[model samples]
Structure formats: C-alpha cells, structure tokens
Target: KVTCLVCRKGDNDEFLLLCDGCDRGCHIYCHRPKMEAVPEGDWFCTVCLAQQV
Candidate 1:
C-alpha cells in the first residue's frame, strides 16, 4: 500500500509522493527538506537513490 516512509501512515494521499523507482511513498511535508509541491519529474526516495551508490 502507498504509505509515507517517514510518517509510516497513508492518511494524506494528497501530499504523498510516490517514488518512481521503488514505489514507496513519502509525504512532501514529511520530507527532510520539505517539498513545496509535487515535483516536476520523476521522484525517487532516499533508499532508491542510495541504491545508485
């Protein structure tokens, strides 16, 4: 199910941003740097980005 990796809740679907790479979810507000809105292109979570290393 789509749930925020940070908050571990799926209550706010409106603010949840799905990771294009891992299909994991994260709220824009729950993000480390906080997002203003849905990002323009594909968005990947920390785990997904870390895998690139």
Candidate 2:
C-alpha cells in the first residue's frame, strides 16, 4: 500500500502508483489531470518517467 503523497492521505492501495524501477509509489490522483487508474505497460516514477530512453 502507498501513502498517497498527493492527497497526503493514509495508506490505501485503491489508488497507488508503484514504480517498477524504484519500487516506490505515488498517488493515482497526483497527476495534473489526476490518474484515473494505474497506467498500462511498465510503470515508472516521475523522475524515471522523464528519463525513459
């Protein structure tokens, strides 16, 4: 379970972003438009997402 950093809420797996690289996670609603659900394909952290090569 991830601690929704965006909403700064308690642990809840209902809306979480688990990074495949860092094993860290983000809230599903942290994005600009807010994440509707965990995206498809390989999941990456914000930093890692921008570094995809």
Best by TM-score: 1
Q: Per-residue lDDT for 1-53 in model 1, tens only?
A: 78998889998799889898988998899988858999879998889999895
**Please, what is the TM-score per model?**
0.88, 0.58
Cα lDDT listed for each candidate: 0.88, 0.69
Task: For model 2, give the 10-residue run with minimal summed lDDT.
Answer: 1-10
| Minimal lDDT window, size 10, model 1 | 31-40
1-53 per-residue lDDT for model 2 (tens digits): 34544675646676677778775677776756666888888777776778777
Candidate 1 versus truth, CA RMSD in Å, comes to 1.0
Candidate 1, backbone clash total:
0
Query: What's every prediction's RMSD, in angstroms?
Result: 1.0, 2.6
Off by over 4 Å in 1: none
